[PDB]
Amino acid sequence: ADNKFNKEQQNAFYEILHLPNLTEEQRNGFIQSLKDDPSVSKEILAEAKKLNDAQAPK
Ligand SMILES: [Zn+2]
């Protein structure tokens, strides 16, 4: 059964890989969540983005 990401899921995955202000530990936790159930991508992405923005350099 083919488990290739649809565009919504792929976009989330790549955005999390590339968000600049996550630590490795933070990033890997979010990616692991998606690897386990990709249907939660939109919620996980929203969390990752908030954390990324909170940790932006000033
Ligand atoms: Zn400054």
From Swiss-Prot:
Record's subcellular location: Secreted, Cell wall
Immunoglobulin-binding region C repeat positions: 1-58
Biotechnology: Important immunodiagnostic reagent because of its ability to bind the Fab and Fc fragments of a wide range of mammalian immunoglobulins.
Domain of life: Bacteria
Oligomeric form and interacting partners: Interacts with host TNFRSF1A; this interaction leads to the stimulation of both surface expression and shedding of TNFRSF1A.
UniProt remark on domains: Each of the immunoglobulin-binding region repeats can bind the Fc region of an immunoglobulin.
Known function: Plays a role in the inhibition of the host innate and adaptive immune responses. Possesses five immunoglobulin-binding domains that capture both the fragment crystallizable region (Fc region) and the Fab region (part of Ig that identifies antigen) of immunoglobulins. In turn, Staphylococcus aureus is protected from phagocytic killing via inhibition of Ig Fc region. In addition, the host elicited B-cell response is prevented due to a decrease of antibody-secreting cell proliferation that enter the bone marrow, thereby decreasing long-term antibody production.
Family indicated by similarity: Belongs to the immunoglobulin-binding protein SpA family.
Name the record gives this protein: Immunoglobulin G-binding protein A
Species of origin: Staphylococcus aureus
Taxonomic placement: Bacteria, Bacillati, Bacillota, Bacilli, Bacillales
Gene name of this polypeptide: spa
Residues of the whole record sequence present: 270 to 327 of 508
